[PDB]
Design a protein around this ligand. Structure first.
Ligand SMILES: [Mg+2]
Ligand SMILES: [Zn+2]
Ligand SMILES: [Zn+2]
Ligand SMILES: [Zn+2]
Lengths: 87, 654, 107, 10, 97, 166, 171, 112, 267
DNA sequence: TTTGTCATTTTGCAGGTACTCTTATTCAATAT
RNA sequence: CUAAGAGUACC
DNA sequence: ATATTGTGCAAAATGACAAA
């Protein structure tokens, strides 16, 4: 599993978050918020888990990492903080 | 209640390994030996011990538990039995394969005919994949009809190197019905290759020899292609009026008992051979009733027996009818009707359909109040809740529970409530050729029996309102809801990857009305202008200066339409013969959201590349493009309502 | 390379594989009247070296079978003298991007 | 063909 | 309503894998079945209340896993088993990608 | 392999077939291979004591037989909780049959057996079995039969008994 | 015998538990679950080494569930009895069939068929013991036993020991 | 050149009636058809004769024969295909499933 | 049939297009790595026109007068004339444009100028012109060195493949060559200073938005392009001397040795 | 002798959803 | 129930 | 008196002839 993990200094994948990655992060975070996860962003009164997760992603307070699997089984760990939500 | 808690670790299937049952594995896994063809005992009220419906294989009644696992019918996967075959029979699907394998292997010594000494055999054995190896080995060893106990020396064809050959004559093997006939070359002599001798010769194939034939040493050995023990599937596979498979297994048991009695009592070889062929036929038709050439096994009612192969194959089989495509819950289907007043991403859902389709909302401190209110409302009005799922899995039906009083919601429970406004729902029209034919809409609960959708979105669905039915699916988890809203949303599907151009556009009344409104003749007075401006929801609130101030304040249609067009949009299309002046008012020039010139028609607001829809969705985003759709439709439909359009017989008269 | 007029007797075809590493390639004149690599449907085929093939497999993380296949009877493969396991780079004038590079492994 | 209009063949 | 093959294909094109899984499992047929890590067959007697898992033949009791598969998948596997074909389901990789 | 059902030789310490997962070399959590070090009663006791005191210090920041029994009971109740009846029993067993006292004794023992360079199972068994006669130990451990000389095992047991304290 | 070995445990955490103390929760749940447990693959697991930084790794969220699956890799001390292994212990009880000896955390039952005939059960002496012509085996007495048979029982590993062989008994 | 001619034929079929499809779709089709060194039919005697997994091969055509052949050859299905995970009812390695989401303890502590 | 054949094709995180077996179908999706929805038809201005029109549109000479520029077009219009370093920059820019012209004529034999490319440069130019209120009379603030270096840096900043080895870098250059030809055709010194009359901030904003839009047009790994392609081919067929329509599509998918109308074209 | 090489024979079925209705269960001689 | 059949709706 | 059994085609394959 050491060989599987590509070191962080030579990740060759896009630093931008994909639409599928954004969708899965939002769904995962909304499900966690619905099941009483701690909220890391201050609430402006909103109650919808999906928009809570959207606000969390806007200011990068989602504590998740994407394990992107290369076809050979190697993976790269991209933290949600360092990913760029352009779309 | 679903399935109760199991301490076993929960994994996902990473690999699926195929193979054949060894007879000893069949005997080791089977929890009962089936000997009596009868399904019910003489009392006609219980399942007979040792019959085809043994309680050890699974309970045929909901009342009683399975005798093996002591679990209900909901939990019991069904445990296999075994029928001990008096004489081996061919597996019908493998007969051809068997015919190949026995044609690659000496029928006496059980060794592969052409070893590595033959020239083309290094090439054949060097093939990587199993199927191609077997094909090459077979197409080379089928033409060799002698075991060749002595082969030419590899170094030189002068001395002879002896391998482990016996030198017997390999017959020519053909298939008649469900058996194999071998004609030995005349030293022809024809006799039926008995299954017992074929099994014996398959058991003598060396590990190296049958691993070079594509067979695995652990998962699929060639001698497992001959059936010596039949695994009896549990009653779940053949639920009860007995199933076709139950009657076929009864026939197999009857033939097995007949052959056993004939062998025990002693009989002419003709009766023994006939009983053996009958047992083989029953096994084969149990596994495959569509054997070419042979007559079908007819059921009690004179119809062909439903074999296992029939249950698997076809459109309505297991794979294509219950696994690739299956009937799903939380789905609705009804007639669609048009609604110009609904947003592009909005769909009108009948109030009864909303009252039936339910979404589970996790009870959270953030939404405890509204969930409590919905539980108070109940399932008889919208909005409301239909079920309350407890953390233990127990389910409280809002019907029949109002007697007990108010239910105190606890965090972590689920309130399965009627779908409300702004809920993402998948919306489909079948056949649904492309991905745009299945898109995520927002619910708008309406009081009539038809689905209501925007007119533009009917174009990607290929939907009319001449009785067309459409399907609605409700996601039941936050993850599916979120990925539906962020991936399958109608605004995100505006630009089609199919032709890198928008798939939705202005259609039908709105297109004609926008052409009529943007003509230079169209001048709108103050009152109609105010009404049209108010109909644009995102209108900034400032009344544009009229195009004509004296002697009467008049606004042109382009000026009012440009209010819907978002600020900062530049479009410049030159039609045939158009100039910077537009004598014909063709082409299009929009500068900063204001229509400088051009009649707005299909080439501008339709589903075209470089049109207003494409430019707006590429410049301001999909949400702004959908809002543009709504605003343009609203303003143009109001103007066309108060201007009028028709067609008559006089329109066809020159 | 043996260039023949009409055909090679099958009795002579069997002895075509000589002692390795020598390889005998037989070509018909009729098939070589018109060069196939000058057709515009035919892109540019460049044989890769073993070092280049190793680098290509390392960088793309590929196994031998995962590369696109080219038969060892294809007219271009015979033209360039491909042997099994050798990878050819294909330079193609694509219309989405100006230049596209493919890699095909001989079978 | 097809089916319809197996294969050919099979 | 029939969530047909080409509806599944449209969902695959949308990239909504979780929605497709929810349609095929939670909405239509979800079945928890016990297998063992020695033989992938589902011949695992699981007395859940007694917390006793036993695969006869393999003679193992501490190498049992549970998998969520559609009941149609279980029926297909059991019909394949009745047809002398073993669909061994394993929860780990024996070959690298 | 993934053989359906398993056929293997029965485990036996005498024949040095300790098991497929008790081999000489094991892959550590760092991914490399290290020799499977086997701990005798004294060295294992010291290792357990070190782990327990480290856990006690982490929780805080976040010798005679009877006094040792009292100390281990108090420490077990402190750093650990319930379901330690087995742990209490084995700690009491180690306290009773403790062949060496402190870090110095067990360190000298482990370095001397490192100079001996025999099987980790065998050396830890020798450190656990306070045998007296060398041929007696050979009979006790069939894994030592026809492997080590009589006099060398006798003398190393002599230095082990010299390092034997209390 | 006592060894130290590399083990891994899969722990499932509810979404509600991902507070700033997730590492402490995982460490707490690894304890009380594997500390002092008994499995057939590794025998008795008694304690865990290197508690300061237990390798917890990242932790994968189960799809459509939300819970996290952590593959915690740790070093654990194990006591796996082996066939034909000589080990010391202390006697704890006696009976007609034999006597039980406390070896580590487990009880080993040496049967009266495995004792010499002169060594006979004696109930007149209190507590009942086993007395021979040369030595007596009493409660809380040291004795070495050679385990020759271990029957794999997950709830509590049971082993068959003997003192029949030469130099097997009281030291 | 066969792939180029195939793309031209498919493009002519699509664009004969004035319709337009982006180059990448037809290019993907023709590349799939010519990835094996020869013209692979979209029929059962071409794309379903590829060792791409028994379960996803059986969902198209000749289901039971494919199962029988896979059992005889003891094929290993690595469950990388979409149809395998559809049949087994698990998240396919597609779209949202083409990666794994994991929780970072250090980032979670770092936020507070 | 088409959907089943292509159901396992996916774009992976190394931008390669692979099936379930891991076999590479395309080393980059669509041979350009761009999402189809982010593609618009744009005109390649270098391939079209005549040599004289091409020179007048692109060639700028700081020494002679046949193709000189108006000094009033930019601020330091009187100091650039006679310069040698800036002349070297112009020389390499025009040489690159001529190379691009030859390349584009090679790629498209018919000289078709309107092709689908990801980022609409024209719309960005128009938006910058409207946002910064180009008065089209004041001399431009841009320096020619700024134009050339900014175009080169923007080309270096258009990343489709993020690898750090020769193979991945070469693949990136091959993947972006056509878009770079379009970019050099649009953002040329003469065109920027004369036809569009950018300013310094307007030019920098144009560069930034081109980079952002190109990075946004890149295909997202995890995209199920096989099913998308199968549906995008099958659905137009539902709207459908030489066989065409459904029979020809089936003769193409069903690779048949004998077809209804075998025709051969000789030039 | 083979060793491929050229004339008979051997297979395997029809898109997607959805609605309603109607009919039907081997017929009859024979032993218990 | 089940199987079969027929007739429809929109593609 | 009731249950029991009497319409649109190319792959493969395969024997009955020639090349060595
Ligand atoms: Mg219609
Ligand atoms: Zn059961
Ligand atoms: Zn033989
Ligand atoms: Zn098993």
């Amino acid at each position: 599993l050491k060989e599987k993990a590509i070191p962080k200094d030579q990740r060759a994948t896009t630093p931008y978050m994909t639409k599928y990655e954004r969708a899965r992060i939002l769904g995962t975070r909304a499900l966690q918020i619905s099941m009483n996860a701690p909220v890391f962003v201050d609430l402006e009164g909103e109650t919808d888990p999906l928009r809570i997760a959207m606000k969390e992603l806007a200011e990068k307070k989602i504590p998740l990492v994407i394990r992107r699997y290369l076809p050979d089984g190697s993976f790269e760990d991209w933290s949600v903080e360092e990913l760029i939500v352009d779309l | 209640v679903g399935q109760q808690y199991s301490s076993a670790p929960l994994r996902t299937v990473k690999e699926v390994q195929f193979g054949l049952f060894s007879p000893e594995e069949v005997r080791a896994i089977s929890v009962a030996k089936i000997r009596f063809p009868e399904t019910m005992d003489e009392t006609q009220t219980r399942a007979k011990i040792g019959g085809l419906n043994d309680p050890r294989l699974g309970s045929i009644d909901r009342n009683l538990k399975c005798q093996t696992c002591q679990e209900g019918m909901n939990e019991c996967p069904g445990h296999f039995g075994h029928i001990d075959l008096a004489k081996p029979v061919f597996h019908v699907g493998f007969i051809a394969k068997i015919k190949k394998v026995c044609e690659c292997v000496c029928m006496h010594c059980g060794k592969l005919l052409l070893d590595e000494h033959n020239e083309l055999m290094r090439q054949a054995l060097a093939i990587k994949d199993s199927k191609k190896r077997f094909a090459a080995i077979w197409t080379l060893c089928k033409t060799k009809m002698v075991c060749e106990t002595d082969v030419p020396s590899e170094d030189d064809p002068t001395q002879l190197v002896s391998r482990g050959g016996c030198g017997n004559t390999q017959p020519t093997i053909r298939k008649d019905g469900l058996k194999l006939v071998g004609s030995w070359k005349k030293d022809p002599e024809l006799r039926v290759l008995s299954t017992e001798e074929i099994l014996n010769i398959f058991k003598h194939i060396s590990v190296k020899d049958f691993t070079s034939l594509g067979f695995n040493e652990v998962f699929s050995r060639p001698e497992w292609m001959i059936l010596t023990c039949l695994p009896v599937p549990p009653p779940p596979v053949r639920p009860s009026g007995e199933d076709d498979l139950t009657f076929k297994l009864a026939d197999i048991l009857k033939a097995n008992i007949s052959l056993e009695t004939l062998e025990h009592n002693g009989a002419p070889h003709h009766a023994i051979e006939e009983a053996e062929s009958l047992l083989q036929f029953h096994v084969a038709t149990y596994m495959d009733n569509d054997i070419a050439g042979q007559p079908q096994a007819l059921q009690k009612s004179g119809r062909p027996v439903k074999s296992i192969r029939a249950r698997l194959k076809g459109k309505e089989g297991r794979i294509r009818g219950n696994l690739m495509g299956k009937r799903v819950d939380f789905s609705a289907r009804t007639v669609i009707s048009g609604d110009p007043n609904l947003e592009l991403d909005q769909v009108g859902v009948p109030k009864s359909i909303a009252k039936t389709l339910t979404y589970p909302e996790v009870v959270t401190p953030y939404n405890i109040d509204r969930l409590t209110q919905l539980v108070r409302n109940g399932p008889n009005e919208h909005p409301g809740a239909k079920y309350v799922i407890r953390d233990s899995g127990d389910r409280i039906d809002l019907r029949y529970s109002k007697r007990a009083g108010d239910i105190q919601l606890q965090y972590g429970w689920k309130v399965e409530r009627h779908i409300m406004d702004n809920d993402p729902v998948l919306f489909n029209r079948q056949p649904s050729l492309h991905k745009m034919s299945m898109m995520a809409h927002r619910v708008k609960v309406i009081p009539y029996s038809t689905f209501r959708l925007n007119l533009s979105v009917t174009s990607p669905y290929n939907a009319d309102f001449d009785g067309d039915e459409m399907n609605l699916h409700v996601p039941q988890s936050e993850e599916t809801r979120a990925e539906l809203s962020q991936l399958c949303a109608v605004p995100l599907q505006i630009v089609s990857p199919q032709s890198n151009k928008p798939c939705m556009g202005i259609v039908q009344d709105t297109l004609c009305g926008i052409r009529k409104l943007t003509l230079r003749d169209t001048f709108i007075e103050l009152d109609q202008v105010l009404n049209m401006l108010y109909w644009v929801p995102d209108w900034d609130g400032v009344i544009p200066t009229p195009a004509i101030i004296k002697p009467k304040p008049l606004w042109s249609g382009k000026q009012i339409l440009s209010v819907a067009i978002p600020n900062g949009i530049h479009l410049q299309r030159f039609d045939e013969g158009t100039t910077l002046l537009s004598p014909k008012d063709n082409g299009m020039l929009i500068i900063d959201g204001q229509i400088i010139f051009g009649v707005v028609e299909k080439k501008t607001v339709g589903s075209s590349n470089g049109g207003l829809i494409h430019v707006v969705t590429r410049e301001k985003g999909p949400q702004v493009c959908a809002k543009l759709f709504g605003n343009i439709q609203k303003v143009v439909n109001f103007w066309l309502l108060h201007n009028g359009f028709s067609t008559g017989i006089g329109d066809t008269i020159a | 390379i043996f260039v023949y007029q009409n055909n090679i007797t099958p009795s002579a075809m069997k002895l075509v594989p000589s002692i390795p590493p020598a390889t005998i390639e037989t070509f018909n004149e009729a098939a070589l009247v018109v060069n196939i690599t000058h057709h515009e449907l035919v892109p540019k085929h460049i044989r890769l070296s073993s070092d280049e093939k190793r680098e290509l497999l390392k960088r793309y993380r590929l196994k031998e079978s995962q590369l696109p296949r080219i038969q060892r009877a294809d007219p271009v493969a015979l033209y360039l003298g491909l042997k099994r396991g050798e990878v050819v780079k294909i330079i193609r004038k694509s219309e989405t991007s100006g230049r596209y590079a493919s890699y095909r492994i001989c079978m | 063909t097809x089916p319809g209009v197996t294969x050919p063949g099979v | 309503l029939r969530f047909g093959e080409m509806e599944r294909d449209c969902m695959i094109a949308h990239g909504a894998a979780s929605f497709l899984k929810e349609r095929l499992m939670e909405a239509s047929d979800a079945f928890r079945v016990h297998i063992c890590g020695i033989c992938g067959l589902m011949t695992v007697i699981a007395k859940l209340n007694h917390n006793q898992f036993e695969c006869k033949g393999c003679d193992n009791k501490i190498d049992i896993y549970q998998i969520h598969i559609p009941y149609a998948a279980k029926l297909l596997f059991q019909e394949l088993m009745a047809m002398n074909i073993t669909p061994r389901l394993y929860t780990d990789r024996s070959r690298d990608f | 392999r993934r053989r359906l059902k398993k056929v293997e030789e029965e485990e036996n310490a005498a024949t040095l077939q300790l098991g497929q997962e008790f081999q000489l070399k094991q892959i550590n959590h760092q991914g490399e291979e290290e020799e499977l070090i086997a701990l005798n009663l004294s060295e294992a006791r010291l290792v357990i004591k070190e782990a327990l005191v480290e856990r006690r210090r982490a929780f805080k920041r976040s010798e005679t037989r009877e006094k040792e029994l009292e100390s281990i009971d108090v420490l077990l109740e402190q750093t650990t909780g319930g379901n330690n009846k087995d742990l209490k029993n084995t700690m009491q067993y180690l306290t009773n049959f403790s062949r060496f006292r402190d870090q110095e004794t067990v360190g000298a023992v482990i370095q001397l057996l490192k100079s001996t360079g025999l099987h980790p199972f065998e050396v830890a068994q020798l450190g656990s079995l306070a045998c007296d006669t060398a041929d007696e130990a050979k009979t006790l451990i069939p894994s030592l039969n026809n492997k080590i000389s009589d006099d060398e095992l006798e003398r190393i047991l002599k230095e082990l008994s010299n390092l034997e304290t209390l | 015998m006592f060894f130290i070995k590399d083990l891994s445990l899969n722990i499932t955490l509810h979404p509600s538990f991902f507070g700033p103390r997730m590492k402490q929760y995982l460490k707490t749940k690894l304890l009380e679950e594997v500390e002092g447990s008994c499995t057939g693959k590794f025998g008795y697991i008694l304690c865990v080494l290197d508690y300061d930084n237990i390798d917890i790794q990242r932790g994968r969220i189960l799809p459509t569930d939300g819970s996290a699956e952590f593959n915690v890799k740790y070093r654990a001390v194990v006591f796996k009895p082996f066939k034909g292994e000589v080990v010391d212990g202390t006697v704890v009880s006696c009976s007609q069939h034999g006597f039980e000896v406390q070896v580590g955390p487990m009880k080993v039952f040496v049967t009266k068929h495995l004792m010499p005939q002169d060594l006979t059960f004696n109930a007149g002496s209190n507590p009942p013991s086993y007395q021979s012509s040369e030595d007596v085996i009493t409660i809380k007495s040291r004795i070495r036993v050679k385990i020759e048979g271990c029957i794999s029982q997950v709830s509590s590993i049971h082993a068959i020991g003997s003192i029949k062989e030469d130099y097997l008994g009281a030291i | 050149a066969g792939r180029a001619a195939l793309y031209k034929e498919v493009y002519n079929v699509i664009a004969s009636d004035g319709s337009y499809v982006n180059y990448r779709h037809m290019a993907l089709l023709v590349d799939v058809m010519t990835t094996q060194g020869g013209l692979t039919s979209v029929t059962r005697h071409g794309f379903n004769r590829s060792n791409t997994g028994a379960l996803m091969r059986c969902s198209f055509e000749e289901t039971v024969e494919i199962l029988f052949e896979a059992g005889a050859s003891a094929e290993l299905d690595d469950c990388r295909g979409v149809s395998e995970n559809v049949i087994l009812g698990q998240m396919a390695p597609i779209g949202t499933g083409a990666f794994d989401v994991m929780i970072d303890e250090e980032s979670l502590v770092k936020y507070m | 049939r088409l959907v089943k054949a292509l159901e396992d094709i996916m774009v992976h995180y190394d931008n390669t297009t692979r099936n379930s077996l891991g076999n590479v179908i395309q080393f980059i999706y669509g041979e350009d790595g761009m999402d189809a929805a982010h593609i618009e038809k744009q005109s390649l201005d270098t391939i079209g026109g005549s040599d004289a029109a091409f020179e007048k549109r692109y060639r700028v000479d700081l020494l002679n007068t046949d193709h000189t520029l108006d000094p009033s077009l930019l601020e330091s219009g009187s100091e650039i004339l006679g310069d040698l370093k800036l002349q070297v920059l112009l020389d390499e820019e025009y040489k690159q444009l001529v190379k691009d012209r030859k390349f584009l004529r090679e790629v498209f034999v018919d000289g078709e100028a309107n092709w689908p490319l990801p980022v609409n440069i024209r719309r960005i130019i128009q938006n910058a012109q409207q946002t910064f209120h180009i008065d089209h009379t004041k001399p431009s603030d841009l320096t020619i060195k700024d134009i050339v270096l900014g175009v080169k840096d923007l080309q270096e900043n258009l990343l489709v493949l993020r690898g750090k080895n020769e193979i991945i870098q070469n693949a990136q250059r091959d993947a972006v060559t056509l878009f770079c030809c379009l970019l050099r055709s649009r953002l040329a010194t003469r065109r920027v200073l004369q036809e569009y009359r950018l300013t310094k901030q307007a030019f920098d904003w144009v560069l930034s938005n081109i980079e952002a839009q190109f990075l946004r047009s890149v295909v997202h790994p995890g995209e199920m392009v096989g099913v998308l392609a199968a549906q995008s081919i099958g659905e137009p067929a539902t709207q459908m001397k030489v066989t065409s329509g459904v029979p020809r599509l089936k003769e193409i998918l069903n690779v048949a040795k004998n077809m209804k109308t075998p025709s051969l074209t000789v030039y």
